[PDB]
Design a protein around this ligand. Sequence first.
Ligand SMILES: *Cc1ccc(S(=O)(=O)N2CCc3ccccc3C2)cc1
Ligand SMILES: *Cc1ccc(S(=O)(=O)N2CCc3ccccc3C2)cc1
Ligand SMILES: [Ca+2]
Ligand SMILES: [Ca+2]
Ligand SMILES: [Cl-]
Ligand SMILES: [Cl-]
Lengths: 8, 8, 228, 228
Amino acid sequence: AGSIPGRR
Amino acid sequence: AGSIPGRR
Amino acid sequence: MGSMERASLIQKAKLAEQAERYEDMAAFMKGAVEKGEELSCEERNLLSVAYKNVVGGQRAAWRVLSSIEQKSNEGPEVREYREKVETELQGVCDTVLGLLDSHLIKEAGDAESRVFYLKMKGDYYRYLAEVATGDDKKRIIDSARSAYQEAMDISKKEMPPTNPIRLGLALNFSVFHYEIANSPEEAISLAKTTFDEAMADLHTLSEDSYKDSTLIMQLLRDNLTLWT
Amino acid sequence: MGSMERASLIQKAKLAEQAERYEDMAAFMKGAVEKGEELSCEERNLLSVAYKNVVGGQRAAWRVLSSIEQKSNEGPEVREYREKVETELQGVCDTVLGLLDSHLIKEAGDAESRVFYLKMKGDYYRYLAEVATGDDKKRIIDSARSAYQEAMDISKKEMPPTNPIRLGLALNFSVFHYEIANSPEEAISLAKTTFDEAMADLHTLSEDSYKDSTLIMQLLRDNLTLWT
Ligand SMILES: *Cc1ccc(S(=O)(=O)N2CCc3ccccc3C2)cc1
Ligand SMILES: *Cc1ccc(S(=O)(=O)N2CCc3ccccc3C2)cc1
Ligand SMILES: [Ca+2]
Ligand SMILES: [Ca+2]
Ligand SMILES: [Cl-]
Ligand SMILES: [Cl-]
């Protein structure tokens, strides 16, 4: 499961 | 120009 | 960083990001926060990017060491070094939480800033929970839950369902439910409802906002694919 | 790291490499060197891998910042931050050079160890030369040249032309000639002669040694392709 990255 | 890497 | 100008700390944080010097970037942004002024949207992103990258590297190292330690439990050095990395990770999380408590959250009145900081608070308690054991785990887990829940309540009242901060908050709260709270059904329900309500609001968006929202919706879908 | 056992420092350096914690790895290997005993072949590789990765990240950051600074020269913050990264890089190079001088080189009597350490000495003076200006550049450049030349003289007398340390030394000395000493013809001649003499000795090697030697020969060929 992945959380949001810092940048696009 | 590349020098040697640390590992293979 | 008390002797450096606020604007110079911000400029140097941007340079540090370009140079992939995330520890420096986080130290510059800590100094900027400690000037005592509120942060703009761009400055909030600099703060979050810097610490997310520092703690992300620590988490990856802790996971490598924890796996080695568990395999060896199937001298004291692997446990000692895992503990050293764990203490350093906890210290960075405590630093970020301290910035949020002194005094970023209490001064944040607009929904975009308050939700952003409360999502950060949930994230850093979640990283503490990943390494916690026992009863201390329980109180840390509840602190993450409470921060994410307050952010969710504000986001649902004040932001459209495609807002990227609202979407990233829902994504990370769903990961909390799946990975920390042992609530995979709550994780799946939150991700699905978030995705579907965002889909129904895409028609309102410009091309650039559409791209931002659909990128995060794809992350929700990627998790749903892994979880179902 | 004076209170930690030598064997525990070595074990923790191996764990740090697996966790991609190269700053920790270098600090563990500095502590192991400072125990005062000679290093085995494996331990020498741990020392070199750790510092090559730390200084390699610093060099990449310095190059990013130096490019930004040059473009802005076509406030003081970019120069100040480039100088900060540069001072940190110089300090790591001085630390490695100090370990070599106190007392790794003077105790190294076998050709494999002495060539390895003198190649390191040439490399860390080369990294100092990359950031040096003016007359200080001249003496630093000569210190790199002198270390590489002594290593070359020993390697040619004591090692076969396929020995991986001999090959990596020749590769890095050729980079020195091309990038630092403004001697591209010397760089090309050294790389070509090294490659051709190794080719003629491959018939003597086992399958595993053949793989090690041919990998470094391909690096020599890659440089020759870029340079000609
Ligand atoms: C939690 C969160 C922080 C920032 C944003 S953003 O709208 O500023 N943005 C940067 C992060 C990101 C990552 C992947 C895809 C898009 C974006 C947009 C949103 C949420
Ligand atoms: C300078 C140098 C150090 C070590 C070696 S090695 O024989 O121990 N070896 C590790 C580094 C490397 C990198 C690429 C391809 C092969 C090898 C082998 C050689 C030279
Ligand atoms: Ca000021
Ligand atoms: Ca001892
Ligand atoms: Cl305010
Ligand atoms: Cl000796």
